[PDB]
Amino acid sequence: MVQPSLPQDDTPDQQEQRNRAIAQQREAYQYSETAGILLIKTLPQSEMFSLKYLIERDKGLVSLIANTLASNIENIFDPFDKLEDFEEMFPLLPKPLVMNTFRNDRVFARQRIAGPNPMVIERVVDKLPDNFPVTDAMFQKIMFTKKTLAEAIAQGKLFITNYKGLAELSPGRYEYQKNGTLVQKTKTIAAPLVLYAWKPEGFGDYRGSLAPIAIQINQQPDPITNPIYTPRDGKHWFIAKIFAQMADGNCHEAISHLARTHLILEPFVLATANELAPNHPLSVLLKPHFQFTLAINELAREQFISAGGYADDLLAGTLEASIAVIKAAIKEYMDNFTEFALPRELARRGVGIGDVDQRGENFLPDYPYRDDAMLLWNAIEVYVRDYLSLYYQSPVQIRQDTELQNWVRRLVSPEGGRVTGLVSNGELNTIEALVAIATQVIFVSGPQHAAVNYPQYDYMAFIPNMPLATYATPPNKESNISEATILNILPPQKLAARQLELMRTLCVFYPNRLGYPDTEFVDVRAQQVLHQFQERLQEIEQRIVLCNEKRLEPYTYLLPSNVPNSTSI
Amino acid sequence: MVQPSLPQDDTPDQQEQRNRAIAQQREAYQYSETAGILLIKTLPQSEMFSLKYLIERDKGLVSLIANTLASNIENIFDPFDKLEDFEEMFPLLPKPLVMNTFRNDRVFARQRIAGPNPMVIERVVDKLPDNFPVTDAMFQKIMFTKKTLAEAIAQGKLFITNYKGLAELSPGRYEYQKNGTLVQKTKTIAAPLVLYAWKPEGYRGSLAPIAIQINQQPDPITNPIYTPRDGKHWFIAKIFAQMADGNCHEAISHLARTHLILEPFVLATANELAPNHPLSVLLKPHFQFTLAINELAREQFISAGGYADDLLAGTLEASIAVIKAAIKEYMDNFTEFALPRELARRGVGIGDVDQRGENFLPDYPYRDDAMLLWNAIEVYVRDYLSLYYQSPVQIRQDTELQNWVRRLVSPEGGRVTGLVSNGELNTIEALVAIATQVIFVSGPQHAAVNYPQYDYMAFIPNMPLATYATPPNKESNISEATILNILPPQKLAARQLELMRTLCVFYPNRLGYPDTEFVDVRAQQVLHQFQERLQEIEQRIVLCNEKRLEPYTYLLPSNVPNSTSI
Ligand SMILES: [Cl-]
Ligand SMILES: [Cl-]
Ligand SMILES: [Cl-]
Ligand SMILES: [Fe+3]
Ligand SMILES: [Fe+3]
């Protein structure tokens, strides 16, 4: 029941124990790497999943055994026989929400602002990419308008998702036995550009909604081998959306999920253990939001990014290519850590709260991820500030905290996570800078991970909406498209089963809850502050419910009751 | 890194530390009960499975997803279409060893001495039970002999498995939807008597089944005595006897007398012994993950809708009653359930020999191999405790050890009324026997009853945990459909394979190889000698398996865990 205190304020015998405790934690929490990704060398037993967590995780795996027994899907690398079969994969599981409406263009587009990866869409400024040769004739034909691309861009109506990150990927390979011999096949890579337009009129109703304009499946334009597809292209348009969804799913899993929630949190958990005493106020604040994070990252090391793991079998590129994308997304996040704060991140894509027209309306008014995440970001910020101000009243105490200074030096260190863009001037000198750091770490661990992890089942457990790999080249625009052509593009049965298995495991339960730690703060002042944060969460929950009532489709993933306290699944 | 020491041999400051540590442990290891079974209230995080364990357990679960994906079995309460379908449940799993030869009478009988439940067979003395009216005409017709039942009993040739303990079971019920209507059905329970005979001729002598009476009260029409000359009726009779053996195995031999009887010893260790107490340092490596696996059994095995509810013959309530009665009888006669005394009480111990000095049951691989492990463990804990206890007064004056015993004997501490003589632990050799039996149960015994489960109970027709139709009339015609209706429906056969695969996927630890070494150099030396003996025992068992009809691998030291952990 020790009261938290800064190291400078203690007695040389108190300081001695802190150093002893820190020395013990350093031995227990040793730094390691797998394929260049920072991870703990050996996991401490105290950091393992609880018994309660294991019981829930086992219920999800047993439920997959039962659902597989009921299902007609087979353990083969053959395609499905019918498109309808993809809808029979859930006899004993909840039906994914996107399954009925996934063919609709609005449903396709909405996923950009309310699906599993609401992190790619950016507003177009000045012009389109020169490798994306959309013409005025195309835009006017799709929008049934006389407006030009330049006029639409000048008014902030055009948005784009550019998947150039996957352009350098080496295509994944798979093999199997079919009649005594070994078959070797290769996945098809795509790095599409997708143009979206915001339509105030909407489809029939006056609500308004983002609509997709064009898709170019690969980066280098060519009128024959890589044309621009539009909604008027019919079946070809449908296939183009499949490849775009595959791109979004690969960026989601590599960049948005694994890299920028799970793995960028690992250095902060390790630096907290390696530099902060158990009774340090920052350790007492951050640790609830690290519960099971080291453990779930070890499972990702063993099951997700391993040879034969989920990323190896399901994603578009080779395991080596996927890990290269993951590490590059980690480095850019760490180099520009402060710039990936939620308001600055949205503003850099031109879809922040500040991006408005002359009237003051946002260019992208319907962004449920943005609106709900902003509420959680602001509430966490207030909570962190009140908490830290209980222990930091003057910025000199920030500068005089040796454990905190070591904590920052460990993070910016090459072997400690290389968070080069953590602080300004090479040192942490102000309370408000530490407020922003702790705010972003808590926001990533809870709200952000909730927003990318939980929609995975609703949108990626139904394979046709977002297949993690495509298994045939895009058909020629002139070429006829049968059901078999699509079934050959979509994943074979065994790999579709593997994708459902992965998505079900990720969203089967909530290991903890935002603002509700296992152990109450020893300090009464901290407990009152935590209580205030919980009260704000209840208010935010009610506001989101009100927002959901008027929204086209409810967006439930950032409801406080659905946000975990930590990245733990 | 604190040298182990007895509490009375410590300074008052040191004693205060032990009392504080013990008080902390008492708060973390609180006693709780589920359906009258002593369990832990809250599992401490340090007692959870490791990350390494969870990785192995997840591999086994994922393998069942993949094996299910490659199977043609469906999620229905219908029977299989063909008996052959039971052999196609393992496209991506190891084929159970018993699958090819389970119809053979010798393979049926040898499971009594080398199967998952080698704990039931007992030698017949004086007479058969009066409710088991086997006649000289039956015995002579089966053995193709003129010897009488009395003469064979006088020579110690006859053995019996009497499953009367299952006679008071309430039959289990299952229900399911069919055409908008809810079908409700009931399992069929049996409490058979099975007569076996030791046949020297066979060359190598082997045990042979002679008669099966499916239920306890004899009746020539509704419960006759079946013999190998009854064809398909004999085959069905063996099914019901195997079902009985499986239910006694899971309720009595596995859950009750490995997992659950170990629980009070783990909690008493945490509640009465300091961390540097020599007995705690000796036993804790053999308790690794035991509290955790018992919590999973509480949640998945004996729970409403759990494995025992779905798979076993009786209702969950009926099964739990059998479990608790086995626990209580074991605790009341704890010393008597030591391995040599247990075997001797069933008349199949090393001392049950004829006039020539030959054992009445020469083929008993469980007995021979377990005796080797029992003797080696006994030497190991004798030398270990000799390092800390040199004279009897130390045992008497060890206040933590005396509280340890008093906690175990107490009603809320597991009621181990037969743990100790004279109401008090007074001698060193008594503690040797207690620790030897606890370590033998947690490692060797659990290995013997747990790991044959896949090889003998994952192939459903060899040992179905429940039967789903009454035994047909002795003169009724038997079709393949009659047997398929007796065997479990598809969904429950899948559930049984699911259970057996998780139980035998991996070995969480290994006998004589703890995670952390003893801080005492003398203690480490004792352990090293124990490992050397395990190596020697491994070679001797390998030689025995070369000279045996079928190899018995489950008590090889490399296959025996250090603790009951799966
Ligand atoms: Cl067009
Ligand atoms: Cl075209
Ligand atoms: Cl007969
Ligand atoms: Fe996740
Ligand atoms: Fe077991």
Contact (Cβ atoms closer than 8 angstroms) between residue B131 and residue B233:
no
Rounded to 5°, the CA angle A494-A495-A500 comes to 100
- The response to whether B259 counts as a known ligand-binding position is yes
- Cβ neighbours of B555 (radius 10 Å): 25
Rg of chain B taking only CA atoms, in angstroms: 24
DSSP A9: G
Residue B564 CA to ligand 5 centre (angstroms): 7
On the 0-12 / 13-18 / 19+ scale of CB atoms within 10 A, B144 is exposed
Region of residue B56 (phi > 0: left; psi between -120 and 50: alpha; otherwise: beta): alpha
Residue B554 CA to ligand 5 centre (angstroms): 13
Strand locations in A35-112, DSSP E? 37-40
Cα(B561)–Cα(B511) distance, rounded to whole angstroms? 5
Cα(A347)–Cα(A342) distance, rounded to whole angstroms? 9
B43 in contact with A at a CB cutoff of 8 Å? yes
Query: Which residue in A has a C-alpha nearest to residue B499's C-alpha?
Result: A62
Contact (Cβ atoms closer than 8 angstroms) between residue A252 and residue A111:
no
Structural domain that includes position A396? 1-569
Q: Which ligand is nearest to the CA of B504?
A: 5
Query: Which residue in B has a C-alpha nearest to residue A494's C-alpha?
Result: B69
DSSP B444: I
Experimental technique: X-ray
Contact (Cβ atoms closer than 8 angstroms) between residue B121 and residue B113:
yes
B350 in contact with A at a CB cutoff of 8 Å? no
* DSSP notation for B237-271: HHHHHHHHHHHHIIIIIIIIIIIIHHHHHHHHHHH
- The closest of B373, B434, B432 to B562, measured between CA atoms, is B373
* DSSP notation for B381-410: HHHHHHTT--SHHHHHH-HHHHHHHHHHHS
Q: Residue A228 forms beta bridges with which residues? A: A216
Would the CB atoms of A62 and B65 count as touching at under 8 Å?
no
Would the CB atoms of A58 and B491 count as touching at under 8 Å?
no
A49 in contact with B at a CB cutoff of 8 Å? yes
Would the CB atoms of A54 and B51 count as touching at under 8 Å?
no
Query: Which residue in A has a C-alpha nearest to residue B63's C-alpha?
Result: A65
Q: Which ligand is nearest to the CA of B143?
A: 3
Cα(A500)–Cα(A99) distance, rounded to whole angstroms? 13
B183 membership: H or E segment, kind and range: strand B181-186
Main-chain dihedrals φ then ψ at residue B38, nearest 5 degrees: -75, 120
Would the CB atoms of A45 and B43 count as touching at under 8 Å?
no
Residue B130 CA to ligand 3 centre (angstroms): 19
Query: Which residue in A has a C-alpha nearest to residue B293's C-alpha?
Result: A51
Rg of chain A taking only CA atoms, in angstroms: 25
Cα(A516)–Cα(A536) distance, rounded to whole angstroms? 13
Residue B518 to chain A, least CA–CA distance (Å): 20
Q: How many domains does chain A have?
A: 1
Q: Output the 3-class SS for A521-555.
A: CCCHHHHHHHHHHHHHHHHHHHHHHHHHHHCCCCC
Q: Helix (H, G, I), strand (E, B), or coil: what is residue B186?
A: strand
Q: Helix (H, G, I), strand (E, B), or coil: what is residue A199?
A: strand
Residue B205 corresponds to which tokens in the numbers above? Answer: 């002598």
* DSSP notation for A351-367: -STT-B-SSS-BSS---
Residue B271 to chain A, least CA–CA distance (Å): 21
Cα(B266)–Cα(B328) distance, rounded to whole angstroms? 17
* DSSP notation for A233-255: GTHHHHHHHHHHHHHHHHHIIII
B49 in contact with A at a CB cutoff of 8 Å? yes
Strand locations in B3-128, DSSP E? 31-34, 37-40, 122-123
- The closest of B558, B471, B379, B494 to B64, measured between CA atoms, is B494
Residues of A in contact with B66 (CB under 8 A): 75
Residue A217 CA to ligand 2 centre (angstroms): 12
- The closest of A526, A555, A533, A201 to A389, measured between CA atoms, is A526
Contact (Cβ atoms closer than 8 angstroms) between residue A212 and residue A341:
no
Would the CB atoms of A74 and B70 count as touching at under 8 Å?
yes
Cα(B200)–Cα(B283) distance, rounded to whole angstroms? 43
Q: Provide the residue count of chain A.
A: 569
Q: Output the 3-class SS for B504-527.
A: HCCCCCECCECCCCCCCHHHHHHH
B423 to each of A353, B328, B402, B489, how far by Cα in Å? 78, 18, 11, 52
Q: Which of B61, B69, B296 sits opposite A75 (nearest CB)?
A: B69
Q: Which of B61, B299, B498 sits opposite A55 (nearest CB)?
A: B299
Q: Residue A183 forms beta bridges with which residues? A: A176
Q: Tokens 């190889």 appear where?
A: B513
Cα(B279)–Cα(B275) distance, rounded to whole angstroms? 9
Exposure string of B425-443, with b = 16+ CB inside 10 Å and e = fewer, is bbebebbbbbbbbbbbbbb
Given the DSSP bridges, would you call strands A209-216 and B31-34 parallel, antiparallel or unpaired? Answer: unpaired
Cα(B434)–Cα(A108) distance, rounded to whole angstroms? 68
Residues of A in contact with B74 (CB under 8 A): 69-70
Contact (Cβ atoms closer than 8 angstroms) between residue A465 and residue A439:
no
- The closest of B107, B99, B95, B35 to B67, measured between CA atoms, is B95
Residue B490's Cβ-side half-sphere holds a number of Cα atoms within 13 Å equal to 20
Residues of A in contact with B61 (CB under 8 A): 58, 61-62, 65
Residue A258 CA to ligand 4 centre (angstroms): 7
- Which of residues 483 through 512 in chain B touch A, CB cutoff 8 A? 491, 494, 498
B212 membership: H or E segment, kind and range: strand B206-213
Neighbours of ion ligand 3 (CB under 5 A): B 227, 229
Cα(B288)–Cα(B231) distance, rounded to whole angstroms? 49
DSSP B468: -
- Cβ neighbours of A303 (radius 10 Å): 18
Q: What share of chain B is helix, strand, coil (3-state, %, to 5)?
A: 55, 10, 40
- The response to whether B40 counts as a known ligand-binding position is no
Q: Which residues of A are annotated as a binding site for Fe(3+)?
A: 257, 262, 449, 453, 569
Residue A414's Cβ-side half-sphere holds a number of Cα atoms within 13 Å equal to 1
DSSP A402: H
Main-chain dihedrals φ then ψ at residue A215, nearest 5 degrees: -135, 125
- Which of residues 296 through 325 in chain A touch B, CB cutoff 8 A? 298-299, 302-303
Residue A254's Cβ-side half-sphere holds a number of Cα atoms within 13 Å equal to 32
- The response to whether B254 counts as a known ligand-binding position is yes
- The closest of A460, A470, A388, A467 to A431, measured between CA atoms, is A388
Residue A454 to chain B, least CA–CA distance (Å): 21
Cα(A311)–Cα(A320) distance, rounded to whole angstroms? 10
Q: Output the 3-class SS for A439-492.
A: HHHHHHHHHHHHHHHCHHHHHHCCHHHCCCCECCCCCCCCCCCCHHHHHHHCCC
Q: Provide the residue count of chain B.
A: 566
Q: Tokens 């064809």 appear where?
A: B231
Contacts of A568 (CB under 8 A, 6+ apart): A53, A291, A292, A293, A295, A296, A511, A512
Would the CB atoms of B300 and A58 count as touching at under 8 Å?
yes
Residue A511 CA to ligand 4 centre (angstroms): 11
Q: Which of A46, A75, A302 sits opposite B55 (nearest CB)?
A: A302
Residue B272's Cβ-side half-sphere holds a number of Cα atoms within 13 Å equal to 20
Q: Which of B48, B73, B296 sits opposite A50 (nearest CB)?
A: B48
